[PDB]
Short mmCIF file of N, CA, C and O in Angstrom, two decimals:
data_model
loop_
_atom_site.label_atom_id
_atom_site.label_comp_id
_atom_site.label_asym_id
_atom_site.label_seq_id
_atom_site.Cartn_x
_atom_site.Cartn_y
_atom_site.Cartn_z
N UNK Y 163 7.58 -8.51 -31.97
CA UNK Y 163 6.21 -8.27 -31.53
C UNK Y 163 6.16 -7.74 -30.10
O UNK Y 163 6.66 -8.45 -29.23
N UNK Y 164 5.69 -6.72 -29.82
CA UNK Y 164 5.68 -6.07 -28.71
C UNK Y 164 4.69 -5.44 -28.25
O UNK Y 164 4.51 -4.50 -29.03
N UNK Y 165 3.71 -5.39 -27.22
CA UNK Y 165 2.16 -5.02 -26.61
C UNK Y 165 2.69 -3.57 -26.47
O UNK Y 165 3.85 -3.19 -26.30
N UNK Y 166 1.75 -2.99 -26.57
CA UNK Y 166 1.62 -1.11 -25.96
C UNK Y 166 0.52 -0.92 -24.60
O UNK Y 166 -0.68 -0.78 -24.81
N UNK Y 167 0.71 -0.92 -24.15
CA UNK Y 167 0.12 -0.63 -22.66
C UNK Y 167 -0.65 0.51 -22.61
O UNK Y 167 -0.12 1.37 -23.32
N UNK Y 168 -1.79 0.95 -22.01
CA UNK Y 168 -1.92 2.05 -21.06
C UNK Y 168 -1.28 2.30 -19.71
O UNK Y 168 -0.26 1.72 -19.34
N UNK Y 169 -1.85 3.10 -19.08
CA UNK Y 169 -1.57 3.13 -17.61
C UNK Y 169 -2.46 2.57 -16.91
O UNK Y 169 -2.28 2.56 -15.70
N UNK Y 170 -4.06 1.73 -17.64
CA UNK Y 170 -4.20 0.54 -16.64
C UNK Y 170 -3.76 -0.68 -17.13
O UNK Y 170 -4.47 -1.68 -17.07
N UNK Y 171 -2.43 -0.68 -17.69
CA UNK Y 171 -1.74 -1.69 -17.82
C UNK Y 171 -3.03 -2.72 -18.77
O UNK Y 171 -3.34 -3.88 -18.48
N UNK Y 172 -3.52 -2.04 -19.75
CA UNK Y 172 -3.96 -3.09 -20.94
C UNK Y 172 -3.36 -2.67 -21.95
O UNK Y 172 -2.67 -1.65 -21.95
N UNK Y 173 -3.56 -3.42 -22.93
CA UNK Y 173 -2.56 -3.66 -24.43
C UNK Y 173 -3.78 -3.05 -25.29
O UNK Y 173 -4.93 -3.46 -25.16
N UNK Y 174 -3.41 -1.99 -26.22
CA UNK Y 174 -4.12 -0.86 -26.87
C UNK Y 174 -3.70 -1.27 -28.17
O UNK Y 174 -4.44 -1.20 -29.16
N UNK Y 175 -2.12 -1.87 -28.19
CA UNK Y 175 -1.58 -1.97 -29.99
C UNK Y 175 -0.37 -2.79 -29.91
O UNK Y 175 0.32 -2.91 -28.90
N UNK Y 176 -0.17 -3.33 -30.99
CA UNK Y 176 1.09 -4.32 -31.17
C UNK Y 176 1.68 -3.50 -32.06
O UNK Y 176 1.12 -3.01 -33.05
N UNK Y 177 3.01 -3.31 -31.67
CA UNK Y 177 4.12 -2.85 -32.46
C UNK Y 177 5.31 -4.07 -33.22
O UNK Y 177 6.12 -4.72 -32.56
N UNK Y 178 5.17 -4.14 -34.63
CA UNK Y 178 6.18 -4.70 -34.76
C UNK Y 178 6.65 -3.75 -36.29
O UNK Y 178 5.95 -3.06 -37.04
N UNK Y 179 8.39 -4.13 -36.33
CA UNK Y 179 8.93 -3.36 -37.80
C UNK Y 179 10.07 -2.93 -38.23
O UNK Y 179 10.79 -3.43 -37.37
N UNK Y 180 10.66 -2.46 -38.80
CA UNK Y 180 11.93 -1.85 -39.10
C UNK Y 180 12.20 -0.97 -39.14
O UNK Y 180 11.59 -0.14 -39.82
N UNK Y 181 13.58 -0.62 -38.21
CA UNK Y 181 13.55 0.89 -37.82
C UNK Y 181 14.31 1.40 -38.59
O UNK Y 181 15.01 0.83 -39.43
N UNK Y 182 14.21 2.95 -38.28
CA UNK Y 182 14.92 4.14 -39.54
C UNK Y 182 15.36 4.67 -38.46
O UNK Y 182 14.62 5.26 -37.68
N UNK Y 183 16.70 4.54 -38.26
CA UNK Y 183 18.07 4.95 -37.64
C UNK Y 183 18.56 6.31 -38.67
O UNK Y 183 18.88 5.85 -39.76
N UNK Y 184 18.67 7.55 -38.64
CA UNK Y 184 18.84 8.70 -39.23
C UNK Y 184 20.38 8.54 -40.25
O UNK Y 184 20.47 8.76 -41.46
N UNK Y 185 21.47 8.09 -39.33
CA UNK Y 185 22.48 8.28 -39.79
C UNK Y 185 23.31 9.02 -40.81
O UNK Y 185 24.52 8.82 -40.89
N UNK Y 186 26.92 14.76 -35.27
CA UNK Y 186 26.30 13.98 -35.67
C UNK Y 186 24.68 13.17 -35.39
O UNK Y 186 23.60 13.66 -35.06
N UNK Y 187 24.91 12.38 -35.55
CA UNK Y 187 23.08 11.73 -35.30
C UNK Y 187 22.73 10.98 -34.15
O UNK Y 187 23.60 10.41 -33.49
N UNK Y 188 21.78 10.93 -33.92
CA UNK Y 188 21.48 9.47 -32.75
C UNK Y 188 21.33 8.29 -32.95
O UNK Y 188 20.34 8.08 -33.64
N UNK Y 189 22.11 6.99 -32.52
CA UNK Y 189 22.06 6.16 -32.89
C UNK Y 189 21.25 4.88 -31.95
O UNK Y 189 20.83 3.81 -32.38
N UNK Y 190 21.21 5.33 -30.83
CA UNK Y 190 20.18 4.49 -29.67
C UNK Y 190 19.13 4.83 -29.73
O UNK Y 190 18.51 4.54 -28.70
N UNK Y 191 18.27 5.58 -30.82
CA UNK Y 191 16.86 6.21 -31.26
C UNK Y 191 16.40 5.80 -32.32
O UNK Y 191 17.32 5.54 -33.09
N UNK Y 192 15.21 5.57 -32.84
CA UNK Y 192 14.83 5.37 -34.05
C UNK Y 192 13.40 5.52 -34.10
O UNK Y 192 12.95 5.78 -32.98
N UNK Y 193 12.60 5.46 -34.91
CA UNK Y 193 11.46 5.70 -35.38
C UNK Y 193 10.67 4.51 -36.43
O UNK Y 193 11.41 3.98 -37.26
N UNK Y 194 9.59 4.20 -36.43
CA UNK Y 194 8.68 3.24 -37.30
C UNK Y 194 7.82 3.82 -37.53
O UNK Y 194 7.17 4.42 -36.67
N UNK Y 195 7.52 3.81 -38.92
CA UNK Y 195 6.19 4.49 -39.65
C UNK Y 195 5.60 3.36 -39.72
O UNK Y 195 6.27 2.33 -39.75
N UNK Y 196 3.62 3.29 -39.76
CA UNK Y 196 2.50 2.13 -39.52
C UNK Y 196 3.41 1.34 -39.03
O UNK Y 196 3.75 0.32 -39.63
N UNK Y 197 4.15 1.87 -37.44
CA UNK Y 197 5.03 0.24 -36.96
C UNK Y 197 3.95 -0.39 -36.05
O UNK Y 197 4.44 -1.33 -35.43
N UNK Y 198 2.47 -0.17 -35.72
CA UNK Y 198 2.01 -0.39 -34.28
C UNK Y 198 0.55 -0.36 -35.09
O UNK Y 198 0.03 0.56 -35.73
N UNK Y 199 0.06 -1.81 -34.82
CA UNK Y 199 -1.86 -1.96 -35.40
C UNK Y 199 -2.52 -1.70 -33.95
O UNK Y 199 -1.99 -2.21 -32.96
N UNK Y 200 -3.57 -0.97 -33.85
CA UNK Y 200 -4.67 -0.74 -33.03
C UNK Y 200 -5.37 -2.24 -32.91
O UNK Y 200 -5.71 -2.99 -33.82
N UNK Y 201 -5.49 -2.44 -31.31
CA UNK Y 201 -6.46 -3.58 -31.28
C UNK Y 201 -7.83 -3.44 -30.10
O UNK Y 201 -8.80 -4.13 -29.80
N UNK Y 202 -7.31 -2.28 -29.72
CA UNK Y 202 -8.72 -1.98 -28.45
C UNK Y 202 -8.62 -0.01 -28.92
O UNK Y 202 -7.77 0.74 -29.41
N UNK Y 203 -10.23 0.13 -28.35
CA UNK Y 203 -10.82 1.05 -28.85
C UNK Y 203 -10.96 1.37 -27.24
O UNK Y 203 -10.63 0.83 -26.19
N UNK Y 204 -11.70 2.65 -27.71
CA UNK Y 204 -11.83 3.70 -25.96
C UNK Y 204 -13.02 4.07 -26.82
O UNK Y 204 -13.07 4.33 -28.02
N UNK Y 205 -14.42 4.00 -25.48
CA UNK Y 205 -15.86 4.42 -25.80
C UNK Y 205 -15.85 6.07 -25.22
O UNK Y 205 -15.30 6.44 -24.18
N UNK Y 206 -16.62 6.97 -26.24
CA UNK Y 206 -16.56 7.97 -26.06
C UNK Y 206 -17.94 8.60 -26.02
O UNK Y 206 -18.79 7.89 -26.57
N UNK Y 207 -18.53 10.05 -25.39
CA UNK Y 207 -19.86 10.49 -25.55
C UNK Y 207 -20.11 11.12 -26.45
O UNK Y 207 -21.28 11.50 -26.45
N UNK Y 208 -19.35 11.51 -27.51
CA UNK Y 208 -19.20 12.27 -28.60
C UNK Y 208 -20.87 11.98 -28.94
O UNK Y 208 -21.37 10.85 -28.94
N UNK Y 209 -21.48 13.03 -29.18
CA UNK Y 209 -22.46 12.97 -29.96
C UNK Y 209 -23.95 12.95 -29.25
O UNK Y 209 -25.03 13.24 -29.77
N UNK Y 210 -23.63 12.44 -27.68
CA UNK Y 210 -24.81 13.01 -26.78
C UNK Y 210 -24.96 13.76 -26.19
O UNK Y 210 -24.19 13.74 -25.22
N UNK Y 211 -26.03 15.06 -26.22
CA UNK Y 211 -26.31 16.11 -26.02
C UNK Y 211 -26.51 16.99 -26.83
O UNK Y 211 -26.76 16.83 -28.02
N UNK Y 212 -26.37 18.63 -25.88
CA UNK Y 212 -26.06 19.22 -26.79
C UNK Y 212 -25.87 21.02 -26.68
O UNK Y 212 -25.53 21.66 -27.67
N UNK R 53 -10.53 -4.83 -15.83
CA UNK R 53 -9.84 -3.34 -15.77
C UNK R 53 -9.91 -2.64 -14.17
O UNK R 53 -10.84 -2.20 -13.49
N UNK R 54 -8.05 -2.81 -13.89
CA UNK R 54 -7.59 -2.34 -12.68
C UNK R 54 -7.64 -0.78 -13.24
O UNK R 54 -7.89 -0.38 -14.37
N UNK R 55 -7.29 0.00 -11.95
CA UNK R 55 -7.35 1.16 -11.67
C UNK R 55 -6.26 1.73 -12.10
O UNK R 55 -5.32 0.96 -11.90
N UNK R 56 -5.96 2.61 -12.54
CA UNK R 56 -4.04 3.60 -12.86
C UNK R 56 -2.90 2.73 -12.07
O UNK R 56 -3.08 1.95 -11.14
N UNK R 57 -1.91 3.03 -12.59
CA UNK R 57 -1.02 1.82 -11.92
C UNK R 57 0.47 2.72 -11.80
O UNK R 57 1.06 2.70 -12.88
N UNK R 58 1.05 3.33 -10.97
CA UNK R 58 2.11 3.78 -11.50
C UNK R 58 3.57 3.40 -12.00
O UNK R 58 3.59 2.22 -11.66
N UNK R 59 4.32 3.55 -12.37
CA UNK R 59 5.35 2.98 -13.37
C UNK R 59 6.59 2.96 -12.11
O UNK R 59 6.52 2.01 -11.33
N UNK R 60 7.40 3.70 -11.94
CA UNK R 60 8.35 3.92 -11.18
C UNK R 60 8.33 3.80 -9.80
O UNK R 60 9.36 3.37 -9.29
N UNK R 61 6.92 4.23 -8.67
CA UNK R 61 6.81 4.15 -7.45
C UNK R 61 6.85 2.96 -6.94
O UNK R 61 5.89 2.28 -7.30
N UNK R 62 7.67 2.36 -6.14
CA UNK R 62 7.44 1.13 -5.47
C UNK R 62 6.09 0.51 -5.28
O UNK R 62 5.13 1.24 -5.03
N UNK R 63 5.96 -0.67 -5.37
CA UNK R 63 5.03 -1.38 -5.07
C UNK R 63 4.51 -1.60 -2.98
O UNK R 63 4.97 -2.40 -2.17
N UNK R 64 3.45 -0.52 -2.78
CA UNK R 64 3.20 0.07 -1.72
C UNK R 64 2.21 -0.59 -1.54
O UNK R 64 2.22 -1.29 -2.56
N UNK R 65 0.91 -1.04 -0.70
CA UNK R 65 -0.25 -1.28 -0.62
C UNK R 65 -0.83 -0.15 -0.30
O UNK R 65 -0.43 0.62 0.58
N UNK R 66 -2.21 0.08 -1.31
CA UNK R 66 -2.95 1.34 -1.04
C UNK R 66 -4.17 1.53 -0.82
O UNK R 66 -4.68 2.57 -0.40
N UNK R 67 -5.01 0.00 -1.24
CA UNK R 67 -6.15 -0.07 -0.41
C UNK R 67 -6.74 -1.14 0.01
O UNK R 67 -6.00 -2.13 -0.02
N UNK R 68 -7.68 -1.31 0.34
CA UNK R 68 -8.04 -2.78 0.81
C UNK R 68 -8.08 -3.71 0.29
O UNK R 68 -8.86 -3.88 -0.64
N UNK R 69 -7.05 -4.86 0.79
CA UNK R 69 -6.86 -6.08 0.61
C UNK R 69 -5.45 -6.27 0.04
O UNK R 69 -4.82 -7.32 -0.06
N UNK R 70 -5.02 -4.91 -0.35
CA UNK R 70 -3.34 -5.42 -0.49
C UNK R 70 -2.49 -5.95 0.68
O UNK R 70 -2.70 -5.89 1.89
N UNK R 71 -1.56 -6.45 0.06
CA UNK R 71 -0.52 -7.36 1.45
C UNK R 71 0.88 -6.71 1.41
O UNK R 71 1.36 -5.93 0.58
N UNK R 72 1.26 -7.12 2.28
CA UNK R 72 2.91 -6.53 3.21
C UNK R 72 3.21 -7.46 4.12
O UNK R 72 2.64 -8.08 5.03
N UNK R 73 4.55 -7.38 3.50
CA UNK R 73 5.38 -8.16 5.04
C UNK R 73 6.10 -8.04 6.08
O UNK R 73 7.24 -8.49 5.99
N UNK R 74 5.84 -7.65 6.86
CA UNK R 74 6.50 -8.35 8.14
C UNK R 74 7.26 -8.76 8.71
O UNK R 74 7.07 -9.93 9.04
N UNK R 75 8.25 -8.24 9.06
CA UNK R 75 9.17 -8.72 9.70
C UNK R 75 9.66 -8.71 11.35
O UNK R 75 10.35 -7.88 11.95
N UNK R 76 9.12 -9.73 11.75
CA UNK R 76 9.34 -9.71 13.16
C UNK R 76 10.35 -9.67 13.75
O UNK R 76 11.14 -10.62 13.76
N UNK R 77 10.57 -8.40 14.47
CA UNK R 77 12.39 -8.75 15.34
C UNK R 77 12.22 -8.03 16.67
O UNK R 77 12.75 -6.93 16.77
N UNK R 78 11.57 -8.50 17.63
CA UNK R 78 11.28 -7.90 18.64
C UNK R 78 12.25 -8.42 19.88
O UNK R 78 12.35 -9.57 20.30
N UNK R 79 13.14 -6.91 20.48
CA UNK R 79 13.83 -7.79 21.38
C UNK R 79 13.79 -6.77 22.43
O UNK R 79 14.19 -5.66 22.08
N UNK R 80 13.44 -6.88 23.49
CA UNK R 80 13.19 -5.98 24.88
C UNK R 80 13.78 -6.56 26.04
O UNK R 80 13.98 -7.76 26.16
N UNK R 81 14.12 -5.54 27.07
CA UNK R 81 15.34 -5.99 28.32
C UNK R 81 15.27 -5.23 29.04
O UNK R 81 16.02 -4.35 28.62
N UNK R 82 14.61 -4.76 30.40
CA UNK R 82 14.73 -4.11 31.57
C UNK R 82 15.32 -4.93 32.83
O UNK R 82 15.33 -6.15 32.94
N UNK R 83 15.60 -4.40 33.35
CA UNK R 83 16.28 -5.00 34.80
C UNK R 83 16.24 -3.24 35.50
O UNK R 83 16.01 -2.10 35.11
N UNK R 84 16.78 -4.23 37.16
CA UNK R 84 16.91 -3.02 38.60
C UNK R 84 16.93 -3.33 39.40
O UNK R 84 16.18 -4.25 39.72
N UNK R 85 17.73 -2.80 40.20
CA UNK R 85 18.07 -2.96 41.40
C UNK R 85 18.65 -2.22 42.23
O UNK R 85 19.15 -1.12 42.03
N UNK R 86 18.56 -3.14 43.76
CA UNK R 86 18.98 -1.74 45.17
C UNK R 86 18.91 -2.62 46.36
O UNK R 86 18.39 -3.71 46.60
N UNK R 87 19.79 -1.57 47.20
CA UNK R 87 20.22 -2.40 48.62
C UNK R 87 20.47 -1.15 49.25
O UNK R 87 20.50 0.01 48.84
N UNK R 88 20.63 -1.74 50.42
CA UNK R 88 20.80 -0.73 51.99
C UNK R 88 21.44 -1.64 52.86
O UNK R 88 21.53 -2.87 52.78
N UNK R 89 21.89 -0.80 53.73
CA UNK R 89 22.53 -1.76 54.58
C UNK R 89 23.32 -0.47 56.00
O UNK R 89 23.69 0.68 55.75
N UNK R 90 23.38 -1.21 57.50
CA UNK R 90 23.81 -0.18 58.34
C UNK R 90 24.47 -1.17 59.44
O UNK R 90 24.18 -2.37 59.36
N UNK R 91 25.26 -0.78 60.37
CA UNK R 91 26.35 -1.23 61.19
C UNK R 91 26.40 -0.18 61.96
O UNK R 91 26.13 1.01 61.81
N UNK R 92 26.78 -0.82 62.80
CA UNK R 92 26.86 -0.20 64.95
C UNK R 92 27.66 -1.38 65.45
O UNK R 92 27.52 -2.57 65.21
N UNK R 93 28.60 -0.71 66.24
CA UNK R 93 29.50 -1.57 67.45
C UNK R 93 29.85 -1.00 68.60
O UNK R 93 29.98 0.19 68.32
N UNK R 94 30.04 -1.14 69.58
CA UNK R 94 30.11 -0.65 70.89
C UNK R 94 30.76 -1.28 71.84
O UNK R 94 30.27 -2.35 72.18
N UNK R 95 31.81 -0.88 72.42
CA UNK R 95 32.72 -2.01 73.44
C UNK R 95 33.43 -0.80 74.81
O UNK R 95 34.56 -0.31 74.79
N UNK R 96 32.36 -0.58 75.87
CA UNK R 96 33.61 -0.02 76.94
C UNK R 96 33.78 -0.89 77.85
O UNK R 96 33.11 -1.90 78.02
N UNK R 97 34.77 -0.50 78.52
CA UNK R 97 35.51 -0.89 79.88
C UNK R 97 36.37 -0.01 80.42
O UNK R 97 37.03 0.78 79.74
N UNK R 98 36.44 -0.13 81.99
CA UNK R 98 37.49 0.06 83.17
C UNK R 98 37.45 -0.77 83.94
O UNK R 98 36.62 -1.64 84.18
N UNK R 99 38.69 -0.42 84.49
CA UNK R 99 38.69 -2.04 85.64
C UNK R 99 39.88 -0.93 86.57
O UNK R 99 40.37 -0.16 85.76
N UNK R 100 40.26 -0.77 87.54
CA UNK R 100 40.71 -0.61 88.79
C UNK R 100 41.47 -1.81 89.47
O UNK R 100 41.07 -2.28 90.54
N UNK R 101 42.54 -2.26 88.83
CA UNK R 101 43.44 -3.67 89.01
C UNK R 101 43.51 -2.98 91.22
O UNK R 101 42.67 -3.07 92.12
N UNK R 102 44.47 -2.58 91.18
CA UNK R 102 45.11 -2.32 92.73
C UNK R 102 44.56 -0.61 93.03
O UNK R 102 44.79 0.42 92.41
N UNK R 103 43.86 -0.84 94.08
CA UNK R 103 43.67 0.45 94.54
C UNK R 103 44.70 1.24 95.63
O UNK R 103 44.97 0.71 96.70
N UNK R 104 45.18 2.37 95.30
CA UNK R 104 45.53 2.70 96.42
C UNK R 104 44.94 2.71 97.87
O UNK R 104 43.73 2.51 97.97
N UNK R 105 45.79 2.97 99.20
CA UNK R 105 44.64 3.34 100.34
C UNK R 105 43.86 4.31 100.42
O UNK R 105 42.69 4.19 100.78
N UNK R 106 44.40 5.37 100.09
CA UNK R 106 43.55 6.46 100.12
C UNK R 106 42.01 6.85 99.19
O UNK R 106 40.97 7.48 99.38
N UNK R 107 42.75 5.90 97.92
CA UNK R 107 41.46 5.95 97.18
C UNK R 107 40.13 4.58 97.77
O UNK R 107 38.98 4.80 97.38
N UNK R 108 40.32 3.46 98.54
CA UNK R 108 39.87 2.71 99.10
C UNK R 108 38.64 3.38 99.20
O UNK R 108 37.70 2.69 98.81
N UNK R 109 38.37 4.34 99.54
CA UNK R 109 36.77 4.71 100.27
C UNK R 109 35.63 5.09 98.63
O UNK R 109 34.44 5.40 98.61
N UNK R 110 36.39 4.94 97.73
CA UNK R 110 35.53 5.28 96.10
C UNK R 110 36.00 4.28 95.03
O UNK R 110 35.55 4.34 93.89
#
């Protein structure tokens, strides 16, 4: 279980999961598909004005 | 919710009310000095032990 940060240092998503190591290849890299749930939202003006 | 924060730059104070420390090491030392100094001596004499006659009159 691991927090995702912004750059004002708040937590946006928790990452947790199993990684897909490619396996030449890179092996200190990997990737997670749906590894990270959204838990804070960003308010936007979309839609006022015009 | 603080302001941008950067990742790598040292931890600097950048606006009011951040803190820093201090380190006091203050060490200072003047000095000076001077002299003069002067000397004089002075010693004559004659003396005329036995006069001749002829010189008798000086």
């Amino acid at each position: 279980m691991t927090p995702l940060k912004g750059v004002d240092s708040q937590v946006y998503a928790l990452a947790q999961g199993n990684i897909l190591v490619g396996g030449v290849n890179q092996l200190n890299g990997g990737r997670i598909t749906n590894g990270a749930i959204i838990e804070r939202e960003l308010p936007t003006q979309f839609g006022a004005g015009n | 919710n603080y302001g941008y924060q950067p990742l790598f730059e040292d931890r600097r104070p950048r606006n009011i009310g951040d803190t820093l420390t201090i380190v006091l090491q203050e060490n200072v030392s003047a000095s000076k000095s001077s002299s003069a100094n002067a000397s004089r001596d002075g010693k004559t004499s004659f003396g005329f032990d036995t006069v001749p006659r002829y010189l008798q009159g000086l």
